[PDB]
């Protein structure tokens, strides 16, 4: 169920590799790449590079590892030494260690204390007193000194030493012993629980120490074996909100699963939408959140996170078994709880859920691949297929084989079969584009309804959809309008139970009857309720909410709501509070495009809507909402339209303006703007912000599209530009972002 | 040579199918949908859709023809009748034409006259009176008035009329006259003339038609199995020519592009697996706008967008399951003897593309390759692999050697560099030394000293060169050297100053024409004049878009083309002048790769990345020529909009259309918003702006088209706004908006 958003170089980030991921209390993540080092909000990336003339610069732009301490502050380790982040001036601090005329590398940083480091460079590890800015080299002892450290990782009052040759080490921070726990290189180290440490090696797979028993487990790759690891080079390692263990091989993702001691395999196929966006992992780390990143070698970063997806989309994918086509039509549940799914040049999917198997039924044969509506006959073992210029084909499920009906061999008056109803006695109702058609099976016969009983003649109008309720009669529904029907024998009749009312003559797509009797129909111009008691009639548009007025399916859940897809989307309606709560394609939706016919409820419950780009499935009842709702930080100050930096020459900056609580603005620094942010990974960039410049707005203003601000000509006094921001599942932070602006008068 | 933009649900397009496709004198581009018409401006959607409650909005959501007429006017036909977009209220009027109760749809609109249309519906044709603001169906013959058309096209004084069973009808304008034009029955989508001997008929079933209606004489152009140069379908929905004199055919199954001589039609199909290929299988619509892009509507796929300038720069990259690169992340690409192109790649193998038969062939091997060299005399190519040794592929016979550690004296068996010595063998540049091998005696030689016997500290070596005056540069991560070669001994020459770039990190080194040494290096790159000994430096801050230079070609005018870690720069050392590209531009991405440029010896050059090869000519690289005038599109007041004929009482007119505005002394707090329609350029434009009167200066925006104003002193001034394309390219005349400021 574990699907990919990708940020990489389109996205801003300076270059492809990330070789280490952290974050810091801002929330800003830091990507250490080949090219850089990437500070990342969410919106935007800000590249640090090296630059000759600025010794405020980062030392060398080929970054190893960046390292948040146990007080917020960001350490990166580069070719040319150890840097600390000043966030602050927004500058760095680089420090040097010199052995034999060379500046040594910085491949790994752990916390001792809160004021010291341990460093490992290639020719040894060495110690950063923090108070002091030095390196300090005779510290440890001569053994732990001459260790060449492919991997720290912090557990307690204990630091794991991974090594290339001479396998696991630990020191103890409080006693400073140092001693082997238990050949290959050591990649990363893992604490999951005090009875279980896991190892990742180059080559010699994952192992998993108890350091109680001191008892071990070796996990290597089989190709017998489809559960075992992908590889036995693995590259990192992280744990999950949920407890699960990732893990980062050469060749694809593998989580372990507790119950069976077994793995599942995640790859990277570049067709597959959603899939990893390059095989071989190199860092893994989750988040304040929860989320789950993960960095490639030339695919940047791959991210997850569960709320992410709730909505579960089938599509194609090109040469393997899938969905044989993203336009979608009809969806419907056989008593085997397998899915039949009609697609527009794909022909007819059979779906097995649970296996994930699909099955095609397609031209050369049906007739046609355009499929419009279908009906299940479980007692005959017939699947029936109302297609688009192609007629009605009957498969055989046992054989395979299959029985097709047009204009050219049959007595079937119109090719184009939008609706397939068993009558009650035995025969089908075909809702054609000109005319209601009963298909007897026994006599293979076709015959055009003109007339009613009474001889009322039924106009020639096209049938889109049909639909029997609970009193058994059938609603025919078009582009023309609505009717409504009883059955005398093999007759029908107008049953004159809807008002007379301008709804009977709109563009109708769907019908539904509510589990309490109130029906449902879905219509270009909205949707409307019909009670039978009161013959009362309630129609809602998208000046009550709804997010488009074309409303395709409807779909109740256990609650009584509906759920009906749209040009824009999925609403779920309320009829009791009358309120609706929308989502789109950016919540993870197929599309904000669905599709005629394509919906299905299946008996336990889950729903599914298709659209232009596959379909969508979810369970209404179990869906969650992002529940974070993080600060706003404040990311630029300009004046007249020139970025403003701590300490230049406007005297306005002594810190980061993130940093920063109260400016003051000399009486000429009369135009100036501010842009900020918010850094929530789950709703990406979909929040919404408010501010007032508290003292000057008379009223809070929202922002979708940008994130910037300007303000001009102020009267003298103090005021404070307040900022907040809600998630994409509209939920505010309550406590806004402030920055104190004193506006100074003329004298 | 044909690729594709997408504009579609995710862009803003209201719903995926667009029916028709039109333009107005604002440079904005106008589809009719199956839910909302929509005006599009190069940076934003404006959707128009039906509201019960507004009868100033649109009469239905399901709109069928967009027709822009001679005075720019914009006339949308819907499922209810004909409605005019208002361009000075931002509204509509809606107009209904009832027979038989229902109201009639309007699927065609053409211009008799300035002020009256030729409107078509189910039930026959009409006319629309524009000043009377009325249908009227009592003014042409029966003939005319009872015929059901499929397609309306203006040519000069004639209205060629397609219809559903009854083929090709033409009407004049001045003499009233409608008549058959040439006596299939299949029904007639589209009408276009290319010539006054050549008109163009798409039909649903019986394919293409070429009439000559001079000569009255036709051809049919139709589908076969057999032939793939036949026309894609049979079908055929839309057609439009280019600006390049060719037909382009939009049918069921295709895009098809007439060749003419050839006689025939080059097909461009949906394939989701292919990088720039049509969004969807039905090309219902297409349109040339008046920078001579194309834009093809489809039913499901929105719309899909063309201008050779967005294809100056092409893409080859892998296509699954079709012949191409196998693989995207490359490194070396190398010409041989026969002009084919060898190319490494990360995982796919070496690559060899035979520029003759067009085809890509791969051959598989630790898998990275570094280095390739090829022996035309003993037809051999050379491999070099991060971790895997040496290989050579033997060419006749597709066998291949493997020289490693453990079946070999090769020290390390990480190669980056291969060069020929001059006297039989080959110097292979590792990462711990420089390596001699001798094919004959297959023996590596480690070359630890000179024939001083001072020590080759050389380590860590990314490539090597062979200058004109046949001495070998040696560079790698930890700097760069010059060495003499005296038989089978190197020895130093001292020909570089003391300079600190002899220690950088290097990626290439190139010998221009003109003698000068150019390199590569991670802190920009530098130039070598052997003559004065002088070195000159170039970064990021003398206008290179990023410090990571891979790779240096020539081109026939002696600029520099450089590929970086931030797109590809093109740089005149006469000059200094930066001219940069970027992933933005058609480029394969912004990150290209270590080792990966070639200059073929007819002038093609080629440069490859993270996601594919970019190639093109320099000499026949075109830049977007087009500066359209910035349009003001929207006025806000304390951050509500304003509209014509509001409670504020500025605007009576939209603000796209009014030369001046009044702001009463309460009216302090506006903003103001501007756009540029340059479809070649997206959204990749830079503004420039000036409250003249008050401003201090102009500003400019790349990433915002919104300036704020507030408390303003009484007076009047002119806002003035124009912008540049993404080639830097601006348009000198400015847009002007009067305000006045009034008093207290």
């Given at each position: 169920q574990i699907t990919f958003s990708y940020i990489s170089i389109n996205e801003g980030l300076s270059q492809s590799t990330v070789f280490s991921i952290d974050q810091d209390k801002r929330g800003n993540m830091w990507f250490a790449t080949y090219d850089g080092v990437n500070k990342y909000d969410g919106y935007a990336f800000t590249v640090y590079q090296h630059n000759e003339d600025d010794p405020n610069s980062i030392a060398n732009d080929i970054s190893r590892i960046v390292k948040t301490d146990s007080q917020g502050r960001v350490w990166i380790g580069t070719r040319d030494g150890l840097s600390r982040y000043?966030?602050?001036?927004?500058?760095?601090?680089?420090?040097?260690?010199?052995?034999?005329?060379?500046?040594?590398?910085?491949?790994?940083?752990?916390?001792?204390?809160?004021?010291?480091?341990?460093?490992?460079?290639?020719?040894?590890?060495?110690?950063?007193?923090?108070?002091?800015?030095?390196?300090?080299?005779?510290?440890?002892?001569?053994?732990?000194?001459?260790?060449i450290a492919s991997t720290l990782y912090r557990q307690g009052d204990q630091i794991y030493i991974g090594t290339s040759t001479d396998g696991l080490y630990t020191y103890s921070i409080t006693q400073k012993t140092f001693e082997k726990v238990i050949t290959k290189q050591i990649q990363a180290i893992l604490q999951q629980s005090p009875t279980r440490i896991w190892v990742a090696t180059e080559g010699a797979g994952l192992f998993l120490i108890n350091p109680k028993t001191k008892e071990i487990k070796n996990y290597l790759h089989s190709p017998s074996n489809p559960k075992s690891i992908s590889s036995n080079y693995i590259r990192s390692l992280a744990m999950d909100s949920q407890n699960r263990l990732w893990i980062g091989t050469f060749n694809d993702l593998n989580i372990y699963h507790e119950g069976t001691d077994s793995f599942a395999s995640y790859s990277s196929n570049p067709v597959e939408n959603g899939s990893l966006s390059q095989r071989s992992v190199r860092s893994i780390f989750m988040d304040s959140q929860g989320g789950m990143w993960l960095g490639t070698y030339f695919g940047g970063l791959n991210y997850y996170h569960p709320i992410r997806n709730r909505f579960k989309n089938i599509r194609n994918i090109p040469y393997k078994n899938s969905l044989s086509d993203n336009v979608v039509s009809c969806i419907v549940e056989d008593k085997d709880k397998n899915l039949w799914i009609g697609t527009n040049d794909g022909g007819l999917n059979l779906y097995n859920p649970i296996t994930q198997r699909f099955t095609s039924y397609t031209l050369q044969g049906i007739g046609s691949?355009?499929?419009?509506?279908?009906?299940?006959?479980?007692?005959?073992?017939?699947?029936?297929?109302?297609?688009?210029?192609?007629?009605?084909?009957?498969?055989?499920?046992?054989?395979?084989?299959?029985?097709?009906?047009?204009?050219?061999?049959?007595?079937?008056?119109?090719?184009?079969?939008?609706?397939?109803?068993?009558?009650?006695?035995?025969?089908?109702?075909?809702?054609?584009?000109?005319?209601?058609?009963?298909?007897?099976?026994?006599?293979?016969?076709?015959?055009?309804?003109?007339?009613?009983?009474?001889?009322?003649?039924?106009?020639?109008?096209?049938?889109?959809?049909?639909?029997?309720?609970?009193?058994?009669?059938?609603?025919?529904?078009?582009?023309?309008?609505?009717?409504?029907?009883?059955?005398?024998?093999?007759?029908?009749?107008?049953?004159?139970?809807?008002?007379?009312?301008?709804?009977?003559?709109?563009?109708?797509?769907?019908?539904?009857?509510?589990?309490?009797?109130?029906?449902?129909?879905?219509?270009?111009?909205?949707?409307?309720?019909?009670?039978?008691?009161?013959?009362?009639?309630?129609?809602?548009?998208?000046?009550?909410?709804?997010?488009?007025?074309?409303?395709?399916?409807?779909?109740?859940?256990?609650?009584?709501?509906?759920?009906?897809?749209?040009?824009?989307?999925i609403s779920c309606f309320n009829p009791e509070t009358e309120k609706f709560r929308n989502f789109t394609e950016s919540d993870?939706?197929?599309?904000?495009?669905?599709?005629?016919?394509?919906?299905?409820?299946?008996?336990?419950?889950?729903?599914?809507?298709?659209?232009?780009?596959?379909?969508?499935?979810?369970?209404?009842?179990?869906?969650?909402?992002?529940?974070?709702?993080?600060?706003?930080?404040?990311?630029?100050?300009?004046?007249?339209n020139k970025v403003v930096r701590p300490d230049d020459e406007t005297g306005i900056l002594t810190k980061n303006i993130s940093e920063t609580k109260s400016i003051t603005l000399k009486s000429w620094q009369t135009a100036f703007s501010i842009e900020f942010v918010v850094?929530?990974?789950?709703?990406?960039?979909?929040?919404?912000?408010?501010?007032?410049?508290?003292?000057?707005?008379?009223?809070?203003?929202?922002?979708?599209?940008?994130?910037?601000?300007?303000?001009?000509?102020?009267?003298?006094?103090?005021?404070?530009?307040?900022?907040?921001?809600a998630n994409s599942d509209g939920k505010w932070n309550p406590i806004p972002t402030a920055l104190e602006i004193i506006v100074l008068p003329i004298w």
């Open positions: 000043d966030e602050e001036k927004d500058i760095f601090q680089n420090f040097f260690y010199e052995k034999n005329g060379k500046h040594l590398q910085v491949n790994g940083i752990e916390e001792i204390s809160p004021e010291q480091l341990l460093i490992s460079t290639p020719e040894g590890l060495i110690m950063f007193d923090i108070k002091e800015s030095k390196f300090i080299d005779d510290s440890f002892s001569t053994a732990m000194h001459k260790t691949n355009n499929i419009k509506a279908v009906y299940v006959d479980e007692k005959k073992s017939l699947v029936y297929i109302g297609t688009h210029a192609g007629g009605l084909s009957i498969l055989h499920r046992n054989s395979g084989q299959v029985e097709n009906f047009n204009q050219r061999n049959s007595q079937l008056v119109n090719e184009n079969v939008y609706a397939i109803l068993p009558d009650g006695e035995g025969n089908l109702w075909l809702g054609t584009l000109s005319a209601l058609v009963r298909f007897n099976p026994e006599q293979r016969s076709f015959t055009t309804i003109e007339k009613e009983k009474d001889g009322t003649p039924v106009v020639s109008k096209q049938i889109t959809t049909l639909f029997r309720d609970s009193h058994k009669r059938l609603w025919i529904g078009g582009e023309e309008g609505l009717s409504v029907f009883k059955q005398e024998g093999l007759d029908i009749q107008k049953a004159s139970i809807l008002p007379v009312s301008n709804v009977t003559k709109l563009f109708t797509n769907c019908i539904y009857e509510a589990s309490n009797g109130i029906i449902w129909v879905g219509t270009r111009e909205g949707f409307y309720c019909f009670n039978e008691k009161d013959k009362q009639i309630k129609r809602y548009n998208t000046t009550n909410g709804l997010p488009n007025n074309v409303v395709y399916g409807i779909l109740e859940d256990s609650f009584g709501r509906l759920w009906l897809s749209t040009n824009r989307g993870g939706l197929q599309s904000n495009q669905f599709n005629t016919a394509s919906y299905c409820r299946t008996s336990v419950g889950q729903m599914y809507f298709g659209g232009i780009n596959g379909i969508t499935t979810f369970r209404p009842e179990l869906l969650l909402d992002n529940p974070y709702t993080p600060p706003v930080v404040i990311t630029k100050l300009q004046l007249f850094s929530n990974y789950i709703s990406g960039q979909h929040n919404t912000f408010a501010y007032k410049l508290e003292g000057y707005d008379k009223e809070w203003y929202y922002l979708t599209d940008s994130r910037t601000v300007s303000y001009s000509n102020l009267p003298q006094g103090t005021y404070q530009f307040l900022v907040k921001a």
